[model samples]
Target chain A: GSGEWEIIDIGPFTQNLGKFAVDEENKIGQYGRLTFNKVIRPSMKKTIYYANSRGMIKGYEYQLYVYASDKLFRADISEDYQHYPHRKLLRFNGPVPPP
Target chain B: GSKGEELFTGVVPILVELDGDVNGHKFSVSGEGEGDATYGKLTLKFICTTGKLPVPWPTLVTTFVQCFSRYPDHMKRHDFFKSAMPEGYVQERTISFKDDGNYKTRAEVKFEGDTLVNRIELKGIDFKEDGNILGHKLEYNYNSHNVYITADKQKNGIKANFKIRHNIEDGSVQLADHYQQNTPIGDGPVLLPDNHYLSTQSKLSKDPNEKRDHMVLLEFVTAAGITHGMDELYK
Candidate 1:
């Protein structure tokens, strides 16, 4: 499952879905939010296996278009709501009892 | 002019204050109407969301209970209010996300010299009414006029105490229950109306002894600062 970038403060002129896709291997001057799916993670541009889908859903990995002009939205290329990335990242073992 | 009618003929500067304590948690609420310059109406959402997550229905209901009961105390730990208004009430809440910075909400009520809505009424519902959600039916009563509720994962006795004040003449206040079930997971926002609202739902098992697992005790109201009361409590 690939990662995503949470849409955060860019500017007053920032669009809802944002625009384009730009990625650098550094977490230095990056704006907005970039995460490995639901988990907050660093950029995978430095790695070889960057932006990989869960195999060819039909043809060539029914992937999300990440590149256009500039800016970007936070969403993983993998539509893995089935695997539940949030459940793994955020534990919900039921209510906590009083001490 | 009729004394009662003349007394509250129009949008009178009334004060709405409702204090609630659930499972030892406390939440105080008050109200204002379009800064009291618009309609003489008060609005409360029938449904609210908990953001992006796959939360259980019971968890959603429980989260709501804590959200209203505990959210205020938790946020009061770190108030960002620095400015004081000469007239209106300044309400602001900031939620820090550790690394994601913070999320903020602002509801600055500007009522002249002050006075308050239907203020804040949980609407009305027949004490003998029972709401059905999915295949489960949630039966409850509001005869005592108090918010009394109790739950133990298997059974629930959600005792509620409702202290509402509205003009008997306007007769706009409707005592009704329109519950929204938390089933279907995260299908969408909870289905409920702003006014005349009462929601209590759950996922029942094969046991009739088992009530809705989650005892949802929700009470909401909007009010103004005490007209002649001491500033020590409100300020």
Candidate 2:
């Protein structure tokens, strides 16, 4: 093997900005997110959040796990408040459990 | 008419006490609501060696949120569903763990009274795990996929970067970076030898799945001057 090495972008990419609609009746709501370390605003602020969808993805043979930042970290979605009437305004109080 | 009336209705403040022993472990998922009602007051037992859990808590929380959210919408549309709610005010939806599709985690959900938005909560369930921070800092050196990725965090921000190199013809992976290009970087992760890959890298780590992306990260961060750590999984 004498082959020249080259770089490829692979498949991970980020876009749009945190908001998607329901794709179907029983399926999870699709949404958008930033790639890691990317700028959050034009003013040059970045946040420690990334998004990926659930279920298996392409290329690999195994059924690899996928995670979105909201579902992966917060567990609650933006649409949840809109979809139900008995909504509770629960903001994360950080690492502490409620007493 | 019933559908609109149900939508206009919502949950009230009430107490729900659900507690007991499951699989020899204490478990509870009780909630009280309206004026002082709580939605998800949960506690379950588990076994793990790490400081965190193997099961992603964020995803689990999303699971509960999604289930709760779906109930209201389903009630608004289905008459048959509502009719069944009264006879069996207590219903169940089973979720399965990864190891076996047949093995189930029974989630007992309740939809009491007809004039409400059909609010719900988990009554009794077994098993558990937590919030783990792994991908933020990583290492890798792939033997087959011939790719590696790695990312890091700084302050509260993620200083994520990854590099992927491929030999176009044989589909074989290169063992090292060009010395001329790598001179400015330090030999990262103490284990690599001879010039194996390193976690200190750059390039778009775009992948269709986080699993693939994480594998790539592991290859580079875990590889070295060609020396590396052998991969293993626990049961």
DockQ of each: 0.01, 0.01
Score residue A93 of candidate 2 by CA lDDT. 17
Least well predicted 10-residue stretch by lDDT in candidate 2 chain B: B212-221
Docking quality class, candidate 1? incorrect
Give a tens-digit lDDT track for model 2, residues B131-161: 0111111111112222121211221111112
* Candidate 2 lDDT score relative to the true structure: 0.22
TM-score, each model?
Answer: 0.22, 0.24
Writing each residue's lDDT as its tens digit, candidate 1 over A4-98 gives: 43333333212111121223211222443432211122222111121223121111111122322232223222211112221111111111221
lDDT of 1 at A33: 42
True contacts kept of each: 0.00, 0.00
Deviation from native of the Cα of residue B102 in model 1, angstroms: 36
